[PDB]
């Protein structure tokens, strides 16, 4: 028998969790402090993951999210919602993709939950499912109030590939629109 060794390489910044790194870079370009905290497992199979973004105007001494103090979560995967939402502060805001995420009924009492079909928006209204991270980014910014929206949009546009700037501007504006109109469940 032979030992086989195979290498697979792809492009960055494609999933919804890409929203986080853009947001953190945006905060740092403003002169604020930000960390991006990540997680991984010993699992072979791919599965849901998560990125936590921590932003402050003063030194951040703890470069991870404090469980129970998270202000806002956006989730497009049911198991990721169910596994990680327990760290969101009571009365915190959670945006979920209703085509994919199905909270237990009691959750609607603990958190303010909004349904926004981010993936459909990206795929059908923007015309490119890969803009889903920017739809998500705009929604996160608008709901959390963590950063100026015009400041964020500008930074995002300098960060993404030139080829995608048209579509990502539209995706951002649609994210803001949807979050502006969204009502808690």
């Amino acid at each position: 028998s032979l030992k086989y060794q195979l290498r697979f390489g792809g492009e960055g910044g494609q999933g919804v969790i890409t929203a986080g790194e853009i947001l953190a870079e945006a905060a740092i370009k403003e002169g604020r402090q930000a960390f991006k905290a990540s997680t991984y497992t010993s699992q072979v199979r791919g599965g849901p993951t998560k990125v936590d973004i921590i932003i402050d105007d003063k030194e951040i001494l703890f470069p991870y999210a404090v469980e129970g103090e998270v202000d806002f979560m956006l989730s497009t995967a049911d198991k990721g919602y169910k596994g990680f939402r327990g760290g969101v502060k009571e009365g915190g805001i959670i945006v979920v993709e209703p085509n994919l995420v199905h909270p237990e009924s009691e959750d609607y009492k603990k958190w303010q939950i909004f349904e926004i079909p981010i993936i459909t928006i990206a795929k059908d209204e923007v015309g490119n499912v890969a803009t889903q991270s920017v739809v998500a980014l705009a929604i996160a910014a608008y709901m959390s109030k963590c950063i100026d929206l015009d400041v964020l949009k500008e930074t995002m546009l300098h960060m993404v590939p030139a080829k995608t700037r048209d579509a990502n501007a539209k995706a951002f504006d649609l994210g803001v629109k949807y979050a502006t109109q969204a009502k808690p469940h």
Copy 2:
């Protein structure tokens, strides 16, 4: 000022090919590891996973740099950063719309151009199926696993709704890998 704490949860194209391949080999009764990599940079940048497969025990659960048999790449920077670990004369499949090797590379490796993103987006009608196009290409080029065994295993792994598109993706990967010629 306030401290803000935000959580994003989701999910990966070509990476996903590697995971499917490793799980399929383990399901045959072989050994396999998936080795991954990450950075302290705020932006994540290009991605890479290495898949190691053997019938016997694998004592080192990472790729041996200089011994990689096969690489598939859809990102220019990832190609340029990582191909150096591929053995001399090893097989590299690149997406010609996105990856542009320096001319000297064609003398060190056997490089094949397959437009995987276009095949998945246009012929299959679903850009997410690039995972399975890449998987079929990897298996065909590397001979690391029986194509029928892998296709059947993949079919059990994917949701019924996506099965037709994934089977079409797999078949197109094999066709393109079969027809592909190395760049001189």
Copy 3:
């Protein structure tokens, strides 16, 4: 057959993390399912560390700890304690190293908190600071009841260098002894 979720937190070179790995390997060796979930952040320096271990006698559908469902935490660094204890279930068990971790008074009502001077036990009683991971391992296994102790000990001893078995056995035994005597604050 229950699903067990354990959280280990340290900093830098505290082998607290190593406890998690041995434990997961031991469960797998028994024929059970186990995942290790790890974390990292966007800086070059190692800071607080956290490893989550998930063990079941059936398929684990989510390879991360479920925030709010963690059964047990062992913590040897104050920042990691304060940052990650929020995911421990109410009434759940937490062991802290009292020379390094300083919970707010309200925490003692929410969780059962035990103080065990892990670093000093390894340093002074075992005479080898690097055995703290084995002290920690025995405490966690005992407190969570996630694995039989006789089986775990044997597995651990085959996992370590032949000439450290005497010290590691003793470390293990002291972990159990201290866990057995400990009372919640």
Copy 4:
């Protein structure tokens, strides 16, 4: 100059992060790249450190362009040294790492018993990270040694300053005297 350094062990990882933080503190760019695999147990460890005085546009080591490697575990040496540029520097712990003889022609390989130096001469095996740090910084030429020592010394617990300063100075001395195999 862009510097790319690889640290491999099972101690040595910490050397890489101190180096990177010192580079950042002096006003340069630095990233740490890390790797994991699909098992619960920790095995061989490797961290890449990339330093430059301009924007780094790829946050990993470039395989084939690594300037320098320090290795204290055989498996990680055999698995990861292939990414080191031809004629690059590799330092190995000769009590633990055993290169195939053809390696001595491709790379400049120096033998330094880092683990003994920390355990025996400094009297604290944990300071092997600072021994390794000094060797890597000398061998790679990537930073001013005085600045690095002063930054490292601010970074460690005050009670350990004496041990670490000695570990550093020993690192530099053994790297200076070392000859390629």
